[PDB]
């Protein structure tokens, strides 16, 4: 997160971390007791789910293991179209006063609609420097006419773009997976932006979640 502020503490109770080798991999958001969503690139054979806690490492935190991971379909490796994978905890996690559901959206917010992104990932760019503490920062929608003034040929119809006009306000590398929430609804999941981040007048990439809800809840459904 670059020039956010830590999150208040408990205000993200469905932010997860993705960990490998107890090194932050990605973000992600906890849909039920079973299952946490998150980035298709952020893609491994293992996980280690970190929830119910804004600091990484804290005893107090749950700690679940993930032996299985599904992919959209239609993901790309190449134009990063289709970016979210549905991730199976081998135990389910328990529900508290720092682990909540996230709520799924049931429409897509319109451009201008004031969100929040958070994460662990680097709070500086090029240059890292990796928090302990669950970063804040909150950013408007962008408009896809907007948008495409910017990316171009990069942006589909499924991916949703967010910032501040003039500013470095935005998501980095650690960040994927992690959520983009817009009044009460999960909006977006960190996907692409720029390198280095926090480009004044170059938006963040986010996954539309509205546009995949069908997918979620019959790829839940599939398996157990």
């Not at 994460?119 to 929608?141: H, Q, R």
Request: aromatic content about 6%; proline content about 6%.
């Amino acid at each position: 997160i670059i020039d956010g502020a830590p999150c208040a503490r408990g205000s993200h109770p469905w932010q997860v971390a993705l960990l490998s080798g107890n090194q932050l991999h990605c973000g992600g958001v906890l849909v039920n007791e079973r299952w946490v969503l998150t980035a298709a690139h952020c893609k491994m054979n293992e996980y280690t789910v970190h929830l119910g806690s804004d600091t990484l490492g804290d005893r107090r935190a749950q700690r679940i293991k993930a032996s299985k991971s599904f992919r959209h379909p239609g993901y790309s490796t190449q134009t990063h179209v289709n970016d979210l994978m549905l991730v199976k905890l081998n135990s389910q996690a328990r529900l508290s006063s720092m682990v909540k559901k996230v709520r799924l959206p049931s429409r897509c917010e319109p451009p201008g609609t004031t969100c929040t992104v958070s994460g662990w990932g680097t709070t500086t760019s090029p240059d890292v420097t990796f928090p302990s503490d669950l970063m804040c920062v909150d950013v408007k929608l962008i408009s896809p006419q907007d948008c495409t003034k910017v990316y171009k040929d990069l942006l589909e119809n499924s991916m949703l773009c967010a910032g501040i006009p003039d500013s470095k306000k935005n998501a980095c590398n650690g960040d994927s997976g992690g959520p983009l929430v817009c009044r009460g609804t999960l909006q977006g999941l960190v996907s692409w932006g720029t390198f280095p981040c926090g480009q004044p007048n170059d938006p963040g990439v986010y996954t539309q979640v509205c546009k995949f809800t069908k997918w979620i809840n019959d790829t839940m459904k599939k398996h157990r």
